[PDB]
Paper text:
The LOV and PAS domains are connected through a long linker helix denoted the Jα helix, while the HK domain belongs to the HWE family. Upon blue light illumination, B. abortus LOV-HK photobleaches as a result of the adduct formation between its flavin mononucleotide (FMN) chromophore and an adjacent conserved cysteine residue as in other LOV proteins.
To address whether these differences are indeed light-induced structural changes or whether they are simply due to different constructs crystallized under different conditions, we conducted dynamic crystallographic experiments to examine the light-induced structural changes in the photoactive LOV-PAS crystals. We collected 22 crystallographic data sets by subjecting the LOV-PAS crystals to various dark and light conditions at room temperature before freezing. Although the dark and light crystals belong to the same space group, they show small yet consistent differences in their cell parameters. In the light LOV-PAS structure, all four subunits exhibit the tilting of FMN toward the Eα helix forming stronger H-bonds with Gln132. It is highly possible that the FMN tilting results from the widely reported light-induced adduct formation between the FMN-C4a and Cys69-Sγ atoms, which is not fully resolved in our electron density maps. In addition to the FMN tilting, the LOV domain moves concertedly as a rigid body in response to light. Specifically, the LOV domains undergo partial separation across the dimer interface in both the AB and CD dimers, which is also evidenced by the increased intersubunit distances in the light-minus-dark difference distance matrices. Instead of moving with their respective LOV domains, the tethered Jα helices in both the AB and CD dimers move together sideways perpendicular to the helical spine, resulting in asymmetric responses between the partner subunits.
Author numbering:
A (entry chain A): 19 to 273
B (entry chain B): 17 to 273
Write the structure that this text describes.
């Protein structure tokens, strides 16, 4: 005849405590295996003492007063406080404390459900401020790039080695017959290339990536019918899915 | 029954969903569910009792996960396993499950107790935070690779300046225009020493006045360390946000008046 609730508290993964308020200083009279494992204390090392022994230097004094006022008022309380393991390792202890009254209405026990939320209040929180930091830097480093190609008027383009997706500057879109807003793929450039230069272009474009800079020159017939001679100095960014960089310029004058 | 059972109360008041089943009854039905469990699933108390815990399951739920629990229960062994379940509304969620067998003194199986936890949006949050960091790491590194490539290949006199501080960065072409050495530290004052005194006041004021994110141009005369007089044009713009940064492109336009 085993008590299923006793066994539930016994076998749960979540730390639980029970204190007897009728004794002085309201000491711990029970601690499930989960609690002893989290804090690293043995059973005989936590019995008989108040739960304030888990506190330390990083423990917010304001958090302690809240718990004190709740216990003195015999009222429940949920709070996140900084506690310490036997080794010294600090951890965020999500505290859920509930008073237990008898039939008459007198206080009989205090029970609590401790939960280690260190990875939420300490790990996730910094990963949110770390990610936000990267966003600024990413947006900035791009703002420098976009500003240079604009005021220096450079036909700058990028190309994904596999998908063939591209980005083009204002100058690059003027060299070809492109509009400032339309999406640009490697195929929309290939459509402008003269018939005789096409095979040379796509073979160089789909050639095995090397971190070395290379030059390539081909002719295009723009969408208005104007034949233009282009020169391009390109370089591939090594990776699993490389990004090809390239600066194109119109050299039709004096071929 | 004057005094309450603290263990009973602990399970009652906890925010962790907990179930108790009686394996002596057919198909091992639920005989208890704390208020925590009823809020998670959205079922009433009388809508859970007498049922097996498989009613939370449905489509998308891996049948391999079920057989793992099935074999664990049959062997009277504890088991930790995540699984897909369905709350009353139909909303699917991930159920972190911790089941433990309860034996008496004789070794006779009496009960099963469990801990339930909703870890759907929890695991989903971190699997997107670790894929987001990888992308932004590559992007920043590559957008930095793009910048240096353009400046070098296109021979641009490009400089950056922390507006408040005054510390500057200079490209190879930028240093050749003013007449700097490729490895000396460059401050805004270092440039001012070369600017002619007639145009010197007009330069500092224009650089000082505009902290906004509005583009502006300025042209002045300088004299290098060797004495060469050069007319310059600088097109600059400051990036508003936290510690400001002034970007500027300068080209030598030594052409006759
Ligand atoms: C059941 C129960 C469990 C408690 N568990 C913790 C705990 O895990 N960590 C902690 O810092 N305080 C815990 N406390 C609160 C402390 O025992 C103590 O009441 C609090 O630090 C204020 O003590 P003070 O009034 O002497 O300053 C718990 C209190 C109760 C009643
Ligand atoms: C105490 C206890 C709690 C359980 N809780 C769940 C649960 O929350 N979700 C679930 O899918 N299965 C849960 N199960 C397992 C199911 O009740 C069922 O035994 C298991 O899915 C295999 O049953 P089947 O092979 O007939 O499909 C629990 C089992 C026990 C003993």
């Amino acid at each position: 005849a085993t008590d299923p609730f006793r066994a539930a508290v016994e076998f749960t993964l979540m730390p639980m405590l029970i204190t007897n308020p009728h004794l002085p200083d309201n000491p711990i009279v029970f601690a499930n295996p989960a609690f002893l494992k989290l804090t690293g204390y043995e059973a005989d090392e936590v019995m008989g003492r108040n739960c304030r022994f888990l506190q330390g230097h990083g423990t917010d004094p304001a958090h302690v007063r809240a718990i004190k006022s709740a216990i003195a008022a015999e009222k429940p309380i949920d709070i996140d406080i900084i506690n310490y393991k036997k080794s010294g390792e600090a951890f965020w202890n999500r505290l859920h404390i509930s008073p237990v009254h008898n039939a008459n209405g007198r206080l009989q026990h205090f029970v609590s459900s401790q939960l280690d939320v260190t990875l939420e209040l300490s790990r996730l929180v910094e990963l949110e401020k770390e990610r936000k930091t990267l966003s600024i830097e990413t947006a900035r480093s791009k703002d420098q790039l976009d500003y240079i190609v604009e005021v220096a008027n450079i036909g700058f383009w990028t190309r994904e080695f596999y998908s063939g997706k591209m980005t083009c500057s204002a100058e690059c879109r003027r060299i070809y017959g492109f509009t400032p807003d339309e999406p640009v793929h490697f195929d929309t450039i290939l459509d402008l290339v003269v018939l005789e230069d096409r095979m040379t272009v796509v073979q160089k474009a789909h050639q095995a990536v090397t971190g070395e800079p290379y030059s390539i020159e081909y002719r295009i017939v723009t969408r208005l019918g104007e034949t233009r001679w282009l020169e391009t100095r390109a370089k591939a960014l090594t990776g699993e899915n490389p990004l090809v960089l390239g600066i194109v310029q119109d050299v039709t004058e004096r071929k």
